[PDB]
Amino acid sequence: HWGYGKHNGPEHWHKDFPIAKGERQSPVDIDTHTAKYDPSLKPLSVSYDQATSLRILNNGHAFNVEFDDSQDKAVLKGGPLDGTYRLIQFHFHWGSLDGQGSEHTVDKKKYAAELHLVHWNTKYGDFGKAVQQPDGLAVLGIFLKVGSAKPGLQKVVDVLDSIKTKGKSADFTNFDPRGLLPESLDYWTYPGSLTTPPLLECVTWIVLKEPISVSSEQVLKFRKLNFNGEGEPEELMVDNWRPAQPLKNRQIKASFK
């Protein structure tokens, strides 16, 4: 049902998913003039050395690069987090134009795309249980701008032809998500939600300040994906982003001065 089209986009989601109008919805605009440095944040720890990618899937809204999350292979800890969060998948949101595509915004600026590395809190045993908890997930968000190519993204780009349409998957082993990180791990953090239905308010968001650069050709290949299934009318998978939601009774904290 829901999507990013003319008649089922974000402004409609509340009908089936009333938390869309909830108190802790994501994404949000990050106002760098009101986010306050929090000296209590602990150091943030990205431990991806043992990550095991498995597969890439076009799910009809984005594509997910999936990982083995049956052991502590690729974990996020530190920062605002208590305990250990295991990487389950990453995916992106992107635009039809280089001036839009991100979900979070920074002083109202939209980036060309946004990467979400999704992790679940191991204290809840599995992802499906974790999403029912306010501290169930930690999502590392990374902005993409168009400029230089990102060499560590090219393996993703090159497999997209094999998953053009909804429901297609491909083997995708030995991919290193460290190749998608910027140099700095400085971040903003706030409590929020999944940005797609069911929009559950289970996420500690960790949004990196430093964007990564991807080339025009890399983003153009994202924009060749399809929302539709094979044999259905072609609808390019573009503008698969939810706009900023009201901050309400939340504060955004910065890890850096």
The binding site for Zn ion (CB under 5 A) comprises 116
The annotation status of 119 as a binding-site residue, yes or no, is: no
Alpha-carbon gap, residue 37 to 160, rounded angstroms: 39
The annotation status of 116 as a binding-site residue, yes or no, is: yes
Which residue among 1, 14, 61, 119 is the active-site one? Answer: 61
> In this structure, are residues 242 and 229 in contact, taking their beta carbons and an 8 Å threshold?
no
The nearer residue to Zn ion, 116 or 150, going by C-beta atoms, is 116
For the chain, strand residue ranges (E) read 29-30, 36-37, 44-47, 53-58, 63-67, 75-78, 85-94, 105-106, 113-121, 137-146, 169-171, 187-192, 203-208, 212-214, 253-254
The annotation status of 52 as a binding-site residue, yes or no, is: no
Q: Tell the smallest beta-carbon distance from residue 4 to Zn ion (Å).
A: 12
The annotation status of 195 as a binding-site residue, yes or no, is: yes
Whether 61 is a known active-site residue: answer yes
Q: Tell the smallest beta-carbon distance from residue 91 to Zn ion (Å).
A: 6
Q: Tell the smallest beta-carbon distance from residue 251 to Zn ion (Å).
A: 22
Alpha-carbon gap, residue 103 to 7, rounded angstroms: 19
Strands 44-47 and 137-146, bridge-based pairing: unpaired
Helix (H, G, I), strand (E, B) or coil at 211: coil
Residue list for the binding site: 91, 93, 116, 195-196
User: Residue ranges for the binding site for substrate?
Assistant: 195-196
Q: What residues act catalytically?
A: 61
The binding site for Zn(2+) comprises 91, 93, 116
